[PDB]
Structure 1
Amino acid sequence: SGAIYVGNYRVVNRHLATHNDWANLVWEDSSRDLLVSSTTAQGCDTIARCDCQTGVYYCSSRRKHYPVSFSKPSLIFVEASEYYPARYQSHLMLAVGHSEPGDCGGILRCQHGVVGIVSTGGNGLVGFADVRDLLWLDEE
């Protein structure tokens, strides 16, 4: 589990979105495994705007932050997990690292701020849904 809290927005894995998230929907994309909802209090995270390929991600299934190199966002075939089938997912970044289903929501961060959240994994590759293209998260 986990979210990004940027201004009055809440960024979560679409598959982990709550009823309240869907009842306060700003934007959602199944292909990206992303859903954004409204908040009342302002959030403490800042979004990276950058093409960084190095950063650090939180891995709840290890209680550890790991430094990783990661691929630029792209359309990758993801095998089946507990929450999705063997399908394709867009705006995905992969690193070599440990990931389990409950690690989804863990932040990936670079020197510029939050890059993305754990979304996919399999055979020692953790996948992150990118948010750095969501400029609209910075305004209104």
Structure 2
Amino acid sequence: SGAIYVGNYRVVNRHLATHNDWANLVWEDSSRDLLVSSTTAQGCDTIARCDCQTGVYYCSSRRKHYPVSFSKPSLIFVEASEYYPARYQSHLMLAVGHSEPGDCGGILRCQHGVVGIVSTGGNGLVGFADVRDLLWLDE
């Protein structure tokens, strides 16, 4: 679990979105595993606008933050799950690191701000859904 709160928006993993999120839907994309809903309270996260490939992520299954090197956002094959069939997920960045189910939603940050959220894992790898291209999150 976890979310990004920026302006009047809440960014969450689409497969973990609630009834309130879908009732206040702004935008969703199954191919990215992202959903943005509207909030009544003002969010104060800064979204990074950069091509950083190093940062720090929060891993809930370890109650710890880890530094990582991560790949550029790309189309990566993701195995079938209870939420989606086997498919290419777009805008996904991989890193070598721990991640298990329950870790989705943990934030990945660089010195510029929030880069993305944990979305995939397994095999000693962790995948993050990028949010840096969503320029409208501020305006």
**Contact 1:49 / 1:132 at 8 angstroms: preserved in 2?**
yes
Q: Deviations over 1:22-78 (max 9, x none)?
A: 000000000000000001111121100000000000000000000000001000011
Structure 1 residues 47 and 135: alpha-carbon distance in aligned structure 2, compared to 1, 3 A threshold: same
Q: Spell out, residue by residue over 1:70-122, the C-alpha distance to the aligned partner (whole angstroms, 9 max, x if none).
A: 00100001123454443210000000001112100000000000000000112
TM-score normalised according to structure 1 size = 0.95
Q: Conserved in 2, the CA contact under 8 Å of 1:73 and 1:93?
A: yes
Deviation at 1:12, TM superposition (A): 0.1
Runs (5+) with no aligned partner, structure 1: none
Q: 1:84 maps to which residue? A: 84
Whether the 8 Å contact between 1:81 and 1:101 is mirrored in structure 2 is no
Q: How many residues align?
A: 139
Could you tell me the TM-score, scaled by structure 2's length?
Answer: 0.96
Note the residue ranges of structure 2 that are not aligned, 5 or more in a row: none
* Root mean square deviation of aligned Cα: 1.1
Partner in structure 2 of residue 60 of structure 1: 60
- SS where residue 62 of structure 1 aligns? coil
Q: Which has the higher helix share?
A: 1
